[PDB]
Amino acid sequence: VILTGALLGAAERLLNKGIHPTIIADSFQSAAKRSVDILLEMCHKVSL
């Protein structure tokens, strides 16, 4: 649930800059795939 509130403060700062909502959503969509690759590189092997 805390992940919903983490993006509330970040969205309010970007809307004040005069950025179109789709650009903000597309920037988070591109950054989402970047965050997945970070977790995959930091993923450690584990026994079955």
Binding site: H20, P21, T22, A25, D26, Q29
Partner: protein, 513 residues
């Protein structure tokens, strides 16, 4: 009594502002860059967030009759385009606004204004016909142009960023139908959970049901049977019969006759030679164990909509009156197994006998996208199916409305007179449709549209507006093209509906009951 009537003074102003007030909500929904809206329902406390005004304007109560006809004609758009059809109400609102300014300036009779739109609609049909391109002569480019046609029509929902992953879905699915325009053949299932790009196109059928007790989850080389006969409720009769007996001895014989009724019924089912059985209603425990004894699969609780989709996708036939085993056909699939999609495991079919239909698996993040992807896929292959019938296409994306403006401006010179004011007003209102589209992405609707206006008059047809970069780009390079049949119905119906609204000199409100 209590009848409030407005003369031509009040009714003329009230009818024009009615479509403009409610029309402001559908102006920001235009194009792939358009936004969405929210509606708060007093019942069940539900909501619908979408860019298509067919499910928006229908649930919005409004006391202005001007937008009442705009909701009824949305069903025609729902039967043709289905995605981004709000431009019909936006263009009609612009025609009402320009005519409101035309009667305040030119002060001509409103019937003369309608006569101008009649001659202006004729010039719009000539520009779309001469610019129509038919690529169906080459089957290699035809299948490739279906992707370009798809990229235009498949961007509606917030998920349009996944169109690159969803383009392969509608590309191969339209090739599997081979002329099937009905959505009853197309199998659309919703799944909650998983990534947004997890949606794939599988060849087979996906069933949300399961096996009751002993039915093996994996059955190979099975004969699928569909039956509307009654099992779960058994003896239910509905005769003029009554029951009278001397002793409890014959009372149990009626239940023994119930077993003989099902034993003789399963005997006729056993003569079918099927490994799979499907019923419209539930299955009683006694025939459920008989299905497992003879090695027959059991599927129950298939509603009226699902009982057809089983035989339509697999090419089978619903069978009743078991007395004729060899007079019907039996469905067949290569691999029948239970898989797990999301939380709820589903029954997967593979190797269908007839490839006339396909199943599209839809997995998404939230429940809001379930009905949202349903609206985007409400007309998806049917739009591509209409392109299979009518193969003439024209470059869309806001440029086609600018091409028709050149034909209307050319026809306005041959007409001239005092009727050209309404003809030019239609051209000015038509050029404002891509202007609102540029307003939705937050880009420049002044300098860019002014350059696109002069570019059409310079003789460049392929010139258009780029949504991503906000510049002038060719639609053939971006791949934005629309069929001639869809756009012809959008422009014509918008002008025909606007002719009726300008004719209202009176508004009569009866006392509610």
């Amino acid at each position: 009594d209590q009848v409030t009537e407005e003369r031509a003074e009040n009714a003329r102003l009230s009818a024009f502002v009615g479509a403009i007030a409610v029309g402001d909500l559908v102006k920001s929904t235009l194009g792939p860059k358009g936004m969405d809206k929210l509606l708060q329902s007093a019942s069940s406390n539900t909501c619908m967030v979408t860019n298509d005004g067919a499910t928006i304007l229908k649930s919005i109560p409004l006391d202005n009759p001007a937008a009442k006809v705009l909701v009824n004609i949305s069903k025609v758009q729902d039967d043709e385009v289905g995605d981004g059809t709000t431009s019909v109400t936006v263009l009609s609102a612009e025609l009402l606004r320009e005519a409101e300014k035309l009667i305040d300036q030119s002060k001509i009779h409103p019937q003369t204004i309608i006569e101008g739109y009649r001659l202006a609609s004729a010039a719009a049909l000539d520009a779309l016909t001469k610019a129509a391109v038919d690529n169906s002569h080459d089957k290699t480019m035809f299948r490739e142009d279906l992707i370009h046609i798809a990229k235009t029509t498949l961007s509606s929902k917030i998920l349009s960023q996944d169109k690159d992953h969803f383009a392969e879905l509608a590309t191969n699915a339209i090739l599997r139908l081979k002329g099937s325009t009905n959505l009853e053949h197309i199998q659309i299932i919703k799944i909650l959970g998983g990534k947004l790009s997890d949606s794939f196109l599988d060849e087979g059928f996906i069933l949300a049901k399961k096996f009751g007790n002993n039915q093996p989850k994996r059955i190979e080389n099975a004969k699928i049977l569909i039956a509307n006969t009654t099992l779960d409720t058994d003896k239910v009769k509905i005769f003029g019969t009554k029951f009278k007996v001397d002793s409890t001895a014959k009372l149990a014989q009626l239940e023994k006759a119930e077993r003989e009724k099902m034993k003789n019924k399963i005997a006729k089912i056993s003569k079918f030679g099927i490994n799979t059985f499907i019923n419209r209603q539930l299955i009683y425990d006694y025939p459920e164990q008989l299905f497992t004894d003879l090695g027959i699969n059991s599927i129950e609780h298939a509603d009226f909509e699902g009982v057809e989709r089983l035989a339509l996708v697999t090419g089978g036939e619903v069978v009743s009156t078991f007395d004729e085993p060899s007079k019907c056909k039996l469905g067949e699939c290569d691999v029948i197994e239970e898989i797990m999609l999301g939380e709820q495991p589903f029954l997967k079919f593979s190797g269908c006998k007839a490839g006339e239909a396909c199943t599209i698996v839809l997995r998404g993040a939230t429940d809001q996208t379930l009905d949202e992807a349903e609206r985007s896929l409400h007309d998806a292959l049917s739009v591509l199916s209409q392109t299979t019938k009518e193969t003439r296409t024209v470059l869309g994306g806001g440029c086609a409305e600018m091409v028709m403006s050149k034909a209307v401006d050319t026809e306005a010179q041959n007409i001239d007179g005092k009727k050209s004011l309404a003809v030019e007003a239609f051209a000015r209102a038509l050029r404002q449709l891509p202007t609102i589209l540029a307003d939705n992405a937050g880009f420049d609707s002044s300098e860019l549209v002014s350059k696109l206006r002069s570019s059409i008059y310079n003789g460049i047809s392929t010139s258009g507006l780029d949504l991503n970069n906000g510049t002038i780009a060719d639609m053939r390079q971006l791949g934005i093209v629309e069929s001639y049949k869809l756009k012809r119905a959008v422009v014509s119906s918008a002008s025909e509906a606007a002719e009726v609204l300008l004719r209202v000199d009176n508004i009569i409100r009866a006392r509610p009951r």
